[PDB]
Every structure is written in structure tokens, then in C-alpha cells.
Amino acid sequence: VAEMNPNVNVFVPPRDGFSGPAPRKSKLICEATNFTPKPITVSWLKDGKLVESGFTTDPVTIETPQTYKVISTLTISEIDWLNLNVYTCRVDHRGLTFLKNVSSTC
Amino acid sequence: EMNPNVNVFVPPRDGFKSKLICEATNFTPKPITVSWLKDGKLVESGFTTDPVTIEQTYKVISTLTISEIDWLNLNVYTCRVDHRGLTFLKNVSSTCA
Amino acid sequence: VTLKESGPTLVKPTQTLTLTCTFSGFSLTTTGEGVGWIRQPPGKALEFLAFIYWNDAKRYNPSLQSRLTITKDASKKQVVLTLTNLDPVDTATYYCARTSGWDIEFEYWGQGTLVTVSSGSASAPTLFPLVSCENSSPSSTVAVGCLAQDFLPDSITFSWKYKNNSDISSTRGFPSVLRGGKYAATSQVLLPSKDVMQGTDEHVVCKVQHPNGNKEKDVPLPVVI
Amino acid sequence: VTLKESGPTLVKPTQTLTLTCTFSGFSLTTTGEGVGWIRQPPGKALEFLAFIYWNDAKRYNPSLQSRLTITKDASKKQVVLTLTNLDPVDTATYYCARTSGWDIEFEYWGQGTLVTVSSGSASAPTLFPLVSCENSSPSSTVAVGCLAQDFLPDSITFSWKYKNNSDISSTRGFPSVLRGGKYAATSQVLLPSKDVMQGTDEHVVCKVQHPNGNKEKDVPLPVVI
Amino acid sequence: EIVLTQSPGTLSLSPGERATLSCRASETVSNDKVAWYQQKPGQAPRLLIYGASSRATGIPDRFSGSGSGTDFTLSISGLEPEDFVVYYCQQYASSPRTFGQGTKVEIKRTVAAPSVFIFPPSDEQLKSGTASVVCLLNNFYPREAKVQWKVDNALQSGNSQESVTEQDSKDSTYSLSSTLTLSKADYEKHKVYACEVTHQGLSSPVTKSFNRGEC
Amino acid sequence: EIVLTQSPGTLSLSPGERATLSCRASETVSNDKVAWYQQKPGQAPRLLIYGASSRATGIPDRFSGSGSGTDFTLSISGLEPEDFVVYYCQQYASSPRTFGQGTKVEIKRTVAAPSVFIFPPSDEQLKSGTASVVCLLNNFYPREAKVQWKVDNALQSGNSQESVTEQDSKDSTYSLSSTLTLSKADYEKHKVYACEVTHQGLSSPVTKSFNRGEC
Ligand SMILES: *[C@@H]1O[C@H](CO)[C@@H](O[C@@H]2O[C@H](CO)[C@@H](O)[C@H](O)[C@H]2NC(C)=O)[C@H](O)[C@H]1NC(C)=O
Ligand SMILES: *[C@@H]1O[C@H](CO)[C@@H](O[C@@H]2O[C@H](CO)[C@@H](O)[C@H](O)[C@H]2NC(C)=O)[C@H](O)[C@H]1NC(C)=O
């Protein structure tokens, strides 16, 4: 009944979000909500380099226009985060690319 | 019987309303209760719990709806996890503050 | 022993209908041998019209008496059937058979021919797109169809192809029904759900092979996702 | 017309077994009337032991001849049956009936009594917990059982209760089997899987009502979740 | 005029079992001159037994006929998948002769829930002044099924022809299509169109409907 | 000595249908003095027909007897749920008399997949020197089923008694229990214990097993 552009949101850990034996590790969450079509491609970029390992994407589930939600988790290292590395979530939607840039800089 | 790990995610420093996700992983048994706190006060609405999924280990995720003004007001948000009679509390705040 | 029928495929109501039963390999000289006509409307049972014995002995049905005539010609070895006062409800396929004696009745049958009695003309078929309005229940699979309407006589074969001219096995063929002097039929196709929500192809072509035109309209896919 | 049996409920092998068939309301004076004994081992068919007519006329089975004796006492109006050389395979329930003439045979039947022939003694039943080892397949529901063993005679009723002394409708009762001179039986109960992963009650109590002791052991649930 | 009635019209049999076909005549037939015929859809009918007791050339011996007078029964041993066709009994002692209604035999199968789909008329078709709403039933058993049209809580009648396909060769199921025909002016005066499907394997009826303008 | 054999041992009938019970005698019976008896589990047997042709007091007229000599058939019209009990035929012209094996009638129902559960012996029971492994089958039809014990790929034999319950009053299904008995020393010499269950409604056999020490 309708087509809406996907929304890109990136979640990052806080300053006290790292735990475990050294080196500490955390996770990054990229979620798209109220997007159509249901299929979606999620890719992670680190300083222009594609990430091909250490990531797990949950299956798309249903949250009147039909809505869907997708959750993706990427494992990151504390050392890389401290080096002001920029993480970008790549979303593909009918040939359109949406990018969101996040960083620890204030 | 292993204590569940409690992790709280925060919105990006350079901007996004937003949502708070509390994740408990590598816990047993399956039943688990997750709640949210706001400045030491019980939250009665604005939070939802997703069905528990299988990663034997299980995974549970909870979503809390927050506003931009409240997050920037240095309010304290705590994720409460109860498992096998034990309560875990994690406090987070603004990193740039 | 074999029999072959022949005649016009389209006749107007209230006219004269003539059919010929062509047989070869025997002669109507021995006793007991005879030829009869049996018709069967679609969805109904066999109907007996008339039977003719040797020595120019003919029998007629009282329900259809004074309406049919039986004539035979030994020179051409074929019986001639004449039908008057044509009615749309009398449309059926006519068969002829040979009786090899007094007890063995209708031992050999031919092939028959469809004789349609409709006031209309043999116009080209008309295709109409069909979009499924199903909602809140995708289920295991979904189906789409193609509405072939206004065709005469009923002889249509359905084939489904994708945008890239692929092959689809539907095998779902609904029989035609006489509605308002014309035959109407619908054909559907079963496709996997995953394939529909995948390739960029947003439409498929509906193809019909009718001897009145080679038109082929395309039905746009509603797309699931 | 009614009949009542009586006798010992437990007899040792290679001994003397005596049974009395108590009847009231008629006298063995008219011709044709007679009394007979019919036994039936569990899982087997009826077995004919002997029959006695009037005028002190008695008949015996050749397969069991010179092993049974029939005696009647008109004063007490009850027939006395004596069984010698008791064998465990001969354990069965004995019934007596009245024949009201020559054609109407065994018109009225009594109730019977179970005569168990076992070398052992009537010991108290022993309960054993049963833990479900099912894994990788929760299925519809989970089941837990209770193994009542070493009981004699076979008279046990099973009831299932929760930790809070609730009521359960199991109705799963298995018949007892003679194994090594003792009867063994098993009882189970079906409980929903949701309740296991919910209330803190991690065990249930197995209760048996046998006239040799009022013990009641509890069967702990294995919990799967 | 000898009236021949065959019952039951449709019967469900299994391969390898025995099938008995009944043929009822309105009066006695002289010399028991009754014959049986086999007809397959698409092809031409073929004679099997003449005189109710003598088989013809090229007919297997598994077909047996018995009875006389006004009662005739056809027994077939070793039922085959190719034998699930329509059979007719006919007598040739009347002159003119008459044919019976015929009986159809189907392969017995388990009950399968049908799928219901409704296609609203296309915009192009509405321009022609005729609107056709279809109701499709697929993969149901037995063939007997009730299809009722309900629009604006008003039950329709006298305007449904109904077309049903034959038994599937590889699936042994049945399918039928019901078409709703109404005037273009009447179509614009109604909002919701729904067809009700009732099946033996469904606990409750399932109804599907659509809203005008959203499709 | 008159041997009486009744066949079939178990037959599946439906309510409202007709049931025929056969009684075979090893020799002719004088004056056709054959009687039928009805027995219900738990209660006492009751006489129905004496002399194979005369009913007794308090017996419904729906029970009919026929035949003579060495062939006797018992026909019952209007089968009732309460009539699904064991029936015996007996003759009183022998002196001494003999009884037949008896036939059991069950309610016909559809095939339902059984549930298999195995409980390893408890630690407390092992202290007594006896180990009992159980194999439970519930909600299966028909009553005929094969239960085989396989431990360490060695098929066991001569050590299984097998107990089977009666037909359920409200479910019409059957249940049986199989108990595995072995010495305590032999129990410690084997690792995996499994019972194989074969059912008509299962495409492939289902096997359940457990590992020693994990339960
Ligand atoms: C025409 O395009 C369709 C796309 O809908 C192709 O179908 C896909 O390709 C595979 C291999 O032929 C098919 O089996 C699947 O149905 C489709 N794949 C997936 C992942 O859904 C089709 O193959 C194309 N035709 C040709 C000749 O290549
Ligand atoms: C004893 O505890 C059990 C818990 O295992 C109670 O069972 C629950 O309570 C309802 C109401 O009685 C039962 O119908 C259900 O089986 C259980 N609830 C759910 C949500 O499964 C049981 O009620 C308790 N006994 C008493 C007397 O209260």
C-alpha cells in the first residue's frame, strides 16, 4: 500500500560499556524500522574497509502499512574504538544506499 | 547456572527520539525478567520486551523509549535483571559529560 | 475399423446442421449392422438421437420425432445427418459407431467433432488483468490468474512465462461455461512465495493460443514485499 | 437370586485351598439344578473345574481328575471346594453359578474372590523415583512416573498431587505383571511443560493406598525448560 | 421409453479394492440385452461388455457382469488408476435405445484445507461496463463444497454458474472457480464483496473481503 | 473333550454396525446345546442366550443366534458402546463342559502416532541391586505394536514380560509399558539403553536413548 525510505540508526557503547579480559570488546547495533521492502542488506565499514567477519544479523521480524524491523550486531575491539575509528552502517534499499557515521568524538 | 551479562547502549555522541537496548546473553535457564529505571523511580510505561531467542544459550533484548531532552538532562537510567534470585544493576550516563 | 466425423464448427441457431460420418473397411450389407448417432452435452450424459438398420430401416426417438432425418449413400459409404431447429441447449459433440451384429453394439467409436450453436460470432479472445487483493494472510503460497473472456469456440491453451521468457508449469485449467451466449473461463498459476519477492521482474505475460488472434497481454505483479 | 464367595486371599504353594460359595433363596432339591466352579486367569479365558448335580451326582474334568473334591452341605446351603497341589500358574478368580434347569445354564453369577498363590509374603509396596531423561525434544508435554514394586496382593490405587496438595486427573493405570513371584506395576502422569518453567514447585508426591503400609515417596521433576 | 438411473453419482474408491456399479431400469428388458460402456474425458467412449455377460475383444477379464431382469451389477477386480473414469449402462432391446445418467469413481484421499483467493475486477475491465469477481478454491477434498456470495450482508442467488476442474493426476485433489457477474452501475453501489467457503475439514468458515479503492 | 476355538481374536467394529462372532467346535454337539456368555472386566460374567436360540430374562431382543451342528454365529443389531466386551461361547452337552478362548471387540478409530518416553533407573533403586528401565507407549492405534529392546547393538530376548492397558473410555486409544530387568553388575557393563517402537502410522522407526551418568 505504500513505500517508505528506510531509517538508519546506530547504537554505540558508553565509556563504561567495555568489560571482560583485556583487550575488552563490545557490540554495535544497527537497526532499521518502518522500512519496506522487508529484505535488507546490512554491511559494516571501518575506515573505508568492509567488515566480513565478527558480525551477526538477526532475521527480519514483523514489528495499515506493513512494517518490519531488522537487528544487526557487530563485534568491536576497545583498542579500535580508542583510535577514533568511524563505523558506518551500509543499508541497501531498491538500489539506494544510506550511510550513517558515528564516532567517539564530542 | 551462569550470571547473565548486563550491557546498556547509549545514543551516538554526534546525535541520533532514541531507544535504549539492554541485552542479557549466555544465561540459563530460559526465563528471565528485565526492567528499566529512571533516576531511581519505577517505569510504568514506554518499555517493551522482545521474545527470548536461542543463540545451549539464550538471548533477551529489551527496548525503552526515551526522548532527546531527557537523555541530555543527565538522568540516570538503570537496567534491572533478575535471574536465579540475583539482581544486577548497571548505571550509564553521558560520555562527553 | 475406424470412423471419422466432419462438419461445421460453428452454426447459428434456427438453421440447418449437416454432419458426415466417414467410415471405410466395411459395407452395410450384412444383417444386424447399423449406424447410430450419440451426443453428449458437457457435464451431462450420453443422448441417443437415431439409429438406422439395413434395408433402409430407420428408427427415431419419440422425444425428437419429426425433427431429424437419416439418409445413407452406399456410393460414398457415409451416412448423412440433418439437424433442424438448432437450439443453444442442444450444443454437444456428436459421435457415430458401428454395431457388429445383434449383441455387439457400438464396438468401434470414432473421434467426434464439437458443434457449437451460438448466436454470436467467432471473435478474438479478450484478456483482463487480475490482481489479488489478499491481505493479512500470505499463507504458504499465493496465486495469480488471467481472465480470458469472449472466445468462441472453446479451444485455448495457457502458458506462463516470466519477464526473461522462462518456463512455468501451471497445469491448472478450468473448463469454460456458457454465460450470455459466450464461453467464459479463468486460468491460474502457482508460484513459490520466495521467487515473487526477489527478482526485479515486476510483470509477467499471459499467452493464449486461439485461432482468432495472437494477442498476449501482460499482468503486472502486485509484488509481495 | 444371588451368590457370594469367600476364602483366604493368600495361600502358599503346595498346600490346601478351601473356598465356600454362599447362596440363599433356593434349595438343591429339584432336578436339573446344579452348582459349578469356573476360574479365569488374568489375560486368559474361562476354565471349567467341576460340576455337581442333584442326588449327590458330581462330575470332574479329566484334565484335573483325581485332584479336586466336591462336597455339599444342605444344612448350611453352601458347597465346599477343596484344592490341593497349589501351583503359581493356577492363580485365578473362582466364580460359582446356579443352573435353573437343563437348558438355562449359569443364569445367575456371584462376585468371586481373588486367590493369589505366591511363595512370598504380603510385603509393603516399594516406590522408586523416575527422572525423565528426555532431551532435544520437548514435544507437547513432559511426563513423570512412579514405580510401585513388591506388592501383594494386587490392590493399589494411584493419585497424583502437586506440592500444594492439589488434584491431578491422570487416570493412567497399568495392570500388574507377575515377575519372579511378585507383582510389578508402573504409573505415570501427564503435566504441561509451561507449569514446569513457572511455579517454584520442583517435585510432586506419589501416593499409593495399599493395605500393607501408608508410605508415600516424592518424585522430583528433572526440569527441561 | 426405458428410464435408466444410476446411483450413487460419485463414489470414492481406493486402488486394488472392488468397485460395484448399480444400474436401475424402469422396466424389464427383453433377453437381458444390457451393455456397459467406458468413457474417458477427452477421448471417445469404448465398449467393454455386451449382453451383460460376454466381454468384447481387447477387454481384460477383470471386468465381470451379473444380474438379470431389472437389477444389474458391474464388479471389477483389481481397480487401476486408469479405471477412474465415468461408466454408463445402456440397453439395446428398446429400439429406440436410451442411455443412463452414469456414475463417476474417484480416488479416495484425506481431507485437505482449501485456499481461498478473491480477485477484484481490474480498472481496464470496468471501462467495458462489466465487472467480474472470482472466488478460487484449490486443494480441497471431497469435491462437494458450498460457495456462497455475500455482498453488503445480502446473499446473492441466481447469478453464479460455477466451474469445477477434474481430479488432479498427481495430487488427486479438486479445484473450482466461482465468478460473480454484476452491472457496472450496481458495482459502484456496493463497497465490500466477499465469498464464503465452507469445508468439512475447517472448524469454522473462513471469509475473505476487500475494500473498494484500495486495490 | 470338545475343543472350542473362536476367531478372530480381536476385531474393530463401529457403533451402529453389525458384528458377527464365530464359534468353532471340534465335533458335533448333541441337541445343539450351545450357549453364549457376556463378560465385562471387573464385574462378573452374565448369561445372554441359552440353547443358541432362546434368550434369557433381562436380555434385549437385539441379540440373535443362528446355526447348528459345528457352525454357530452370533449376530447383534444396533451395536452399543457398552457392548465392547469379551464374549465366550460354551456348550453344556459334554459333561464335563468346556469353554472357548473368547473374542474381544474394540471401537474402530483412526491411527494416532504414539509417544515414547524412557526413564533411567534411579540411584536409590540401584542400591537395591536391581535396575529397571521402562519404555512407555501412549495414544497409539491399533493395539498391535512391536517393542524391541536394543542395548549396545545387542538385541535382548526372553527378559520382557510386557503390560498393556485396556481401551480408554473417552479416548478409545491403548497404552502399554515395557520394563527392562537386568542385574546390577550387568547394568554397569552397558552404556546406552534404547527401546525401538514400530508403528503403522510412522514412516520410519523412532528410537530414544540416554547416556549413563547424565541423568
Ligand atoms: C528469470 O528470472 C528469474 C527471477 O525471478 C530467475 O529465477 C531465479 O533463478 C533460479 C535459477 O533459474 C530459479 O530457480 C529461482 O526461481 C530464482 N532464484 C531465486 C533465488 O529465487 C530465472 O532463473 C530467470 N530465468 C533464466 C532462464 O535465467
Ligand atoms: C498449586 O500450584 C500450581 C502451580 O503449579 C497451581 O496451578 C496454577 O494455577 C491455576 C489455577 O489453579 C491452574 O489451573 C494452573 O494449572 C496453574 N496456572 C498456570 C498459569 O498454569 C495450582 O492452582 C495450585 N493449587 C491451588 C489449590 O491453588
Report on this model:
This is part of a larger assembly, with 2 copies of chain A, 2 copies of chain C (225 residues) and 2 copies of chain E (215 residues). Chain A has 106 residues and is mainly beta. Chain A contains 1 helix and 9 strands. Chain A is elongated, with a radius of gyration of 15 Å. The termini of chain A are far apart. Chain C has 2 domains: 1-119, Immunoglobulins (Immunoglobulin-like), CATH 2.60.40.10; 120-220, Immunoglobulin-like. Chain C contains 1 helix and 19 strands. In chain C, the strands form 5 sheets. In chain C, strands 2, 4, 5, 6, 9, 10 and 11 form a 7-stranded mixed beta sheet that branches. A 4-stranded antiparallel beta sheet of chain C has the order 1-3-8-7, with no helix packed on it. Chain C has a 3-stranded antiparallel beta sheet with strand order 12-13-17. The radius of gyration of chain C is 24 Å and the shape is elongated. Chain E is mainly β and 215 residues long. Chain E folds into 2 domains: 1-109, Immunoglobulin-like, CATH 2.60.40; 110-212, Immunoglobulin-like (Sandwich). Chain E is elongated. Chains A and C meet through loops of A and loops of C. A molecule of 2 linked components (NAG-NAG) binds at residues 162, 164, 166, 194-195, 199, 201 of chain D.
Concise synopsis of the structure shown:
This is part of a larger assembly, with 2 copies of chain A, 2 copies of chain C (225 residues) and 2 copies of chain E (215 residues). Chain A is mainly β and 106 residues long. Chain A has one helix spanning 78-82; strands at residues 9-11, 25-33, 41-46, 49-50, 55-57, 61-62, 68-77, 87-93, 96-102.
- Helix/sheet category of chain E: mainly beta
Kindly provide the radius of gyration of chain A, computed on alpha-carbon positions and rounded to a whole number of angstroms: 15 Å
Count of strand segments of chain E: 19
What is the CA-atom radius of gyration of chain E, in angstroms?
23 Å
CATH topology of the largest domain in chain E: Immunoglobulin-like
Counted up, domains of chain A total 1
Relative helix content of chain E: under 10%
- Count structural domains of chain E: 2
For this structure, the CATH topology of chain A is: Immunoglobulin-like
CATH class call of chain A: Mainly Beta
CATH H-level superfamily title of the largest domain in chain E: Immunoglobulins
CATH superfamily heading of chain A: Immunoglobulins
Which second-level CATH architecture of chain A applies?
A: Sandwich
How do the helices and strands follow one another from N- to C-terminus of chain E?
Answer: EEEEEEEEEEEEHEEEEEHEE
End-to-end CA span of chain A = 42 Å
